Amino acid sequence: LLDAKASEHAARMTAMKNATDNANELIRTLTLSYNRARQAAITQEITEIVAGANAL
Amino acid sequence: KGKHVLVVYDDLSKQAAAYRELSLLLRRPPGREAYPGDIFYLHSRLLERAAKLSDAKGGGSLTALPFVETQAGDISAYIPTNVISITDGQIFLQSDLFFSGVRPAINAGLSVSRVGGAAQIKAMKKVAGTLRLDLAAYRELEAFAQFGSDLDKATQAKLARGARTVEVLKQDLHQPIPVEKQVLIIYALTRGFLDDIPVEDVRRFEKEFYLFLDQNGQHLLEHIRTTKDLPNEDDLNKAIEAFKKTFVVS
Amino acid sequence: MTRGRVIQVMGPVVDVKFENGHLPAIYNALKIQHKARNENEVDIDLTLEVALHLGDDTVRTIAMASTDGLIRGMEVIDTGAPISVPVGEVTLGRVFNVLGEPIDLEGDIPADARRDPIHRPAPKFEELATEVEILETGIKVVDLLAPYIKGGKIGLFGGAGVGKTVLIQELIHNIAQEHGGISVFAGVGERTREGNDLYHEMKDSGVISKTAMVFGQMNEPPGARMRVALTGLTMAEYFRDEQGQDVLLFIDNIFRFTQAGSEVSALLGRMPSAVGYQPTLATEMGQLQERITSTAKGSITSIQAIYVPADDYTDPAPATTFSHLDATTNLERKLAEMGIYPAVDPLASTSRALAPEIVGEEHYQVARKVQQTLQRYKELQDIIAILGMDELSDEDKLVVHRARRIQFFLSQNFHVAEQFTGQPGSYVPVKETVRGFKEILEGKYDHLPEDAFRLVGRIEEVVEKAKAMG
Amino acid sequence: MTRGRVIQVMGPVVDVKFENGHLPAIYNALKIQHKARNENEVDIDLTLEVALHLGDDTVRTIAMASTDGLIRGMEVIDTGAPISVPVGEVTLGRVFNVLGEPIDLEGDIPADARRDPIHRPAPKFEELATEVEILETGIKVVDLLAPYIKGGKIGLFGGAGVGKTVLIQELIHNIAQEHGGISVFAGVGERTREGNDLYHEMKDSGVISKTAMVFGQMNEPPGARMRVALTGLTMAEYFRDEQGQDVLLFIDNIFRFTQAGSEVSALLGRMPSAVGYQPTLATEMGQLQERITSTAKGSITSIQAIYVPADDYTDPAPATTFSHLDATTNLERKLAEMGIYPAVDPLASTSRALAPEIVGEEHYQVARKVQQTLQRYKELQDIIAILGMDELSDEDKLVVHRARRIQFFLSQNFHVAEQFTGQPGSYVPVKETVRGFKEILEGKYDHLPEDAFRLVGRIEEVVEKAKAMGV
Ligand SMILES: Nc1ncnc2c1ncn2[C@@H]1O[C@H](COP(=O)(O)OP(=O)(O)O)[C@@H](O)[C@H]1O
Numbered sequence A: 001l002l003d004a005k006a007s008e009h010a011a012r013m014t015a016m017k018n019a020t021d022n023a024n025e026l027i028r029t030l031t032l033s034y035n036r037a038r039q040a041a042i043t044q045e046i047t048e049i050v051a052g053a054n055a056l
Numbered sequence B: 001k002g003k004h005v006l007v008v009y010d011d012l013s014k015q016a017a018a019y020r021e022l023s024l025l026l027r028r029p030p031g032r033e034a035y036p037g038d039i040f041y042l043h044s045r046l047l048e049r050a051a052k053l054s055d056a057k058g059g060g061s062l063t064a065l066p067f068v069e070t071q072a073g074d075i076s077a078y079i080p081t082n083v084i085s086i087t088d089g090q091i092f093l094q095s096d097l098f099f100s101g102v103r104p105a106i107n108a109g110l111s112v113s114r115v116g117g118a119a120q121i122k123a124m125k126k127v128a129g130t131l132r133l134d135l136a137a138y139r140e141l142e143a144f145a146q147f148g149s150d151l152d153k154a155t156q157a158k159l160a161r162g163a164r165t166v167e168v169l170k171q172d173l174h175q176p177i178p179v180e181k182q183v184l185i186i187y188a189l190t191r192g193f194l195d196d197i198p199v200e201d202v203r204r205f206e207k208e209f210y211l212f213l214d215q216n217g218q219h220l221l222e223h224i225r226t227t228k229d230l231p232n233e234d235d236l237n238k239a240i241e242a243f244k245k246t247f248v249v250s
Numbered sequence C: 001m002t003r004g005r006v007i008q009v010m011g012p013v014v015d016v017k018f019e020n021g022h023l024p025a026i027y028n029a030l031k032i033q034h035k036a037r038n039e040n041e042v043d044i045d046l047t048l049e050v051a052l053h054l055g056d057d058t059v060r061t062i063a064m065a066s067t068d069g070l071i072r073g074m075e076v077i078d079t080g081a082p083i084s085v086p087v088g089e090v091t092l093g094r095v096f097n098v099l100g101e102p103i104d105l106e107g108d109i110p111a112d113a114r115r116d117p118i119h120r121p122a123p124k125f126e127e128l129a130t131e132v133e134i135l136e137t138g139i140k141v142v143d144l145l146a147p148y149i150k151g152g153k154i155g156l157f158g159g160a161g162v163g164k165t166v167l168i169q170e171l172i173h174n175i176a177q178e179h180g181g182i183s184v185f186a187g188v189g190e191r192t193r194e195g196n197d198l199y200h201e202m203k204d205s206g207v208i209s210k211t212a213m214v215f216g217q218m219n220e221p222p223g224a225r226m227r228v229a230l231t232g233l234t235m236a237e238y239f240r241d242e243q244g245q246d247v248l249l250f251i252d253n254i255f256r257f258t259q260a261g262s263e264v265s266a267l268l269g270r271m272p273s274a275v276g277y278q279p280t281l282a283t284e285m286g287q288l289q290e291r292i293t294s295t296a297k298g299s300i301t302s303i304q305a306i307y308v309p310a311d312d313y314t315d316p317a318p319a320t321t322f323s324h325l326d327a328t329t330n331l332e333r334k335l336a337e338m339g340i341y342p343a344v345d346p347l348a349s350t351s352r353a354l355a356p357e358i359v360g361e362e363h364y365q366v367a368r369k370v371q372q373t374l375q376r377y378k379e380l381q382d383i384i385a386i387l388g389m390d391e392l393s394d395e396d397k398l399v400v401h402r403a404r405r406i407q408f409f410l411s412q413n414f415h416v417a418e419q420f421t422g423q424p425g426s427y428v429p430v431k432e433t434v435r436g437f438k439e440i441l442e443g444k445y446d447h448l449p450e451d452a453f454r455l456v457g458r459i460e461e462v463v464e465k466a467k468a469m470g
Numbered sequence D: 001m002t003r004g005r006v007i008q009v010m011g012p013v014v015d016v017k018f019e020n021g022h023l024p025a026i027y028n029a030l031k032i033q034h035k036a037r038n039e040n041e042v043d044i045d046l047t048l049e050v051a052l053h054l055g056d057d058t059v060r061t062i063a064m065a066s067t068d069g070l071i072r073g074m075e076v077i078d079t080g081a082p083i084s085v086p087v088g089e090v091t092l093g094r095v096f097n098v099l100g101e102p103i104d105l106e107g108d109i110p111a112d113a114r115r116d117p118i119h120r121p122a123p124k125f126e127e128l129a130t131e132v133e134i135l136e137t138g139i140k141v142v143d144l145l146a147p148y149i150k151g152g153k154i155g156l157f158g159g160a161g162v163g164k165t166v167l168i169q170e171l172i173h174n175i176a177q178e179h180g181g182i183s184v185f186a187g188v189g190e191r192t193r194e195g196n197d198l199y200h201e202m203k204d205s206g207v208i209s210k211t212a213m214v215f216g217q218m219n220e221p222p223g224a225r226m227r228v229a230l231t232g233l234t235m236a237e238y239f240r241d242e243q244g245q246d247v248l249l250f251i252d253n254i255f256r257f258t259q260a261g262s263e264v265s266a267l268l269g270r271m272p273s274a275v276g277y278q279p280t281l282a283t284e285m286g287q288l289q290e291r292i293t294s295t296a297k298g299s300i301t302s303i304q305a306i307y308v309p310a311d312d313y314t315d316p317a318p319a320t321t322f323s324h325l326d327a328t329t330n331l332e333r334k335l336a337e338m339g340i341y342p343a344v345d346p347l348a349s350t351s352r353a354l355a356p357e358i359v360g361e362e363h364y365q366v367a368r369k370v371q372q373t374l375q376r377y378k379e380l381q382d383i384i385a386i387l388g389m390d391e392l393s394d395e396d397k398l399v400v401h402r403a404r405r406i407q408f409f410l411s412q413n414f415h416v417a418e419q420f421t422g423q424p425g426s427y428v429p430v431k432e433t434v435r436g437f438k439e440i441l442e443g444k445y446d447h448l449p450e451d452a453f454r455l456v457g458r459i460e461e462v463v464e465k466a467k468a469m470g471v
């Protein structure tokens, strides 16, 4: 029983570490898309403002 | 003239696009997403003309069901937000719910009716008052119960009840059913009489219940359709028990 | 002589040409009253507000109604003053439009009644009050966790189902009963059926006898949607200035006020702002809000329901609006379902008046302890969830036991809704609220059932209700 | 007779001034034919199409060829009618340009043949037909989850380099060989190499004896790309109406039509739309799409390829086209990279013919179950990525196990892909597809490795591949 408890704790620790690594990778892959979308939004907004100004 | 009218607009997004094109061709200054300003005024003027006239005006009524089509399930877009800010509610449909076997894929969490309660009969109100709480609890628990392994007794009971309710709420295309039979079926669901029925057997249970009511218990349907209220609880309970006894559980 | 001609009609914007040396001033009102000359023309009775001086003796105006049927060359008369609305006791119990014309079925206002201009500069620095004062509302939740500053602006958040109309009616009733002041409602650009329902509810409850209402619902043009709030503000300003009493001003939705100006800006001919709004958004909002201030005599305090589209708090209109608020009240559908009326959220609501040097050290300590206990209970509900099924220390049980009592005691019975439930309702002073919550925290009543704390009012009402229950 | 004069030249847009009271109507064709007066001029043979009336006897036109060499003051002739295209039995087996001049070097069209105007109104409401019937294609995923319709509109959406051309070629190879009617191919804005290869393919296969082609490829100026689709459509309409035949219409990248429209729109003097497109994007596309309909006299079934710019499915040009189609297949780069061919989305693709009373109760049930299990697998993706398979419940393991095999079995080997891989290809009947997917759903093949389902075809080929691998 004692050996089983020790093994359970070690396995949970390893699983949590792997989960943290996967979460960090997902975070960076999402930040790339966030930057792309931010650039696209800024471009669209400035284009709309300039077009509205030129319309007059 | 004192009559009741129902109006359905197939797509207000097409109207918005056409109005934007016309305004741009007339060389009016564009605004957000090239949509001209007063794009909200257009839809407000259109939709605000539907009303329930008072008794002095003849008592007529016009109800409208505008449609708005979204891109990739984005409900926070310009036209969807403008239309949502005008109407008295919204019925939201989702692709994930559509393909998960749930038709007509009503999203209960994101749907709301600002006239609810007053727009229901007494029986339907007193039967379906708790259904929103039931679905809220089911969704909240199911959001994590597939891995949480909490397995508390109350959580298990709530999950089973919510799954049975979700199975009940499904429907087939071009298959309308009377309001009295709806009242009876949600009554049976909420009272817990079908809590032992398997989920896969729930739909066949509902079909057999409608067939059984078509033969016996017809006076309950007549009473509901004549008085807009539930019949005596004991008679309805014993009829439900009789149908449950004669039902073959698979 | 002093007449003009229509030269351009482009939706809500109409251009009028006057003779040299007779131009109308900005914000003046112009009337078009044309009779059908034949069967190819229609009758028109339209009002225009002067906006710009375009030069060459021409003036650009915005219409207060529909411009369908206008013909280039119609005659325009100048009223010589901005739009004027009647003020006084005659406005109480009536319903008006943006032009000050009654829209109910009762008689018209006599032509000799006093009328005041809509546009007015805000009171200057030397006239305002030199200290913060607290408006006693009589509602326990508001008076404890989010005091209403007298003369300040309060933001109200909440959708359908919650008791927003009930809260409004109760506030009007309590203020008129205790502080002796009237209330004013301004329906700026919202649902007509909702406005009608509110009117009928007020008429049934009897609160209508001490209020005036102006409706500019979303079926009206932006010209009226811009000015309805200002008409209501002038109606309240009369009572603030002459009668010298504290009054209430309710605005149905302050976002539509900016939206209408944004709609008309493009046709007026101004360059677009950041998100398509008008470049004058901040100054327009300031000129509207800064007239709602407390002075030496009387004051105006405003409850403004605010709608944030798509919950985007970075939008320029909510961003500008939030810079004027002093308090905040959030209505919770969860509390409404649990039955804890007024369903005011005890944690989401905030107020800058909750300071030790304003409400008092005892009040501040009681409020802070209540907030801490409620936060702990909210955390412990999650801890009860996700495993840990009622396996917690003794202090967790104690704080949950206290928190349920506090949450149920936050509920209160109202003077309104006594026609639905035979309970007469109560008005609970802030000292009594503080004392009762202090006693509950101290455990003086920790042995009582939690059901006895619901809809009681004062602290004793709990003990008599429990004794009656047995 | 009345003549005009060139006023302005700005790229593919030309201004022409006419005598008072003799302005040409909109959509008319104008001809410029100039002979070099001296050594500092070039010969010109160009045609124009009227677009706008600018006032003061001025007309703004669109050129169908390069405008290099035009000089302010050249003489313009008005033909008095829109672009006229030869049509009839002559067009079969020939290749034309946008103007209707053969480019196959196989002779010249007689000068007295019937020619139809390129612009005409759409068919009326009461002239339409609404019969629904399944068009069998031999592709497993198309036949299962999104059946095609005879006489309907079919769209194939996709990004750059995903397989739209391959799917078009496979559909041609599967349908056009045995259709027995008349086929029309319009390659608007596509590769001249692809056009030449496809022409040689029909010449080899003998199908060319019953088809007509108009290319107007991507190297052309926007004027030709804006009208080659109508040039093909008028021949298709003639064959539908006069002879009452059944017509196959293939269009490659109908998005190029709207792209050329947007390119021209800026110079015509219109306010830009949301993302730079023309304001008239909806109506211009509607006037073209609504003419491709099946009527009482005849039926036209059209398969159109649609390009998605930058893989953005919310772009206005792809977004507006969705309302005109009956069955749509959505190709995905994510599926393409994994190795699934065709890389069609099993959930995004939809068809109006997928009903219990049309395809059959068993077919409908199998399709619904497959979509449900695929949706569940898609939902589990985030948890799989974060925690892994270890945290799934017992039945979720089974859901993933079935879903991976279903997704792999949805792939197929194509006849047209033999020259690049050596796989002979397959043609799977819909009954075999339904039976195989039902067997997979029932758990009959849960023991086989998932790689055995990759590119086989029939369900027995899965067993053969697994046994060859050593199972
Ligand atoms: N069934 C298939 N088997 C193998 N490769 C394929 C298949 N379908 C498409 N491809 C790949 O797609 C590419 C051709 O894409 P193509 O259709 O020209 O892109 P687009 O849709 O932009 O025209 C080829 O390189 C080929 O490798």
Ligand SMILES: [Mg+2]
Residues within 6 Å of the ligand: D164, D165, D190
């Ligand atoms: Mg291609």
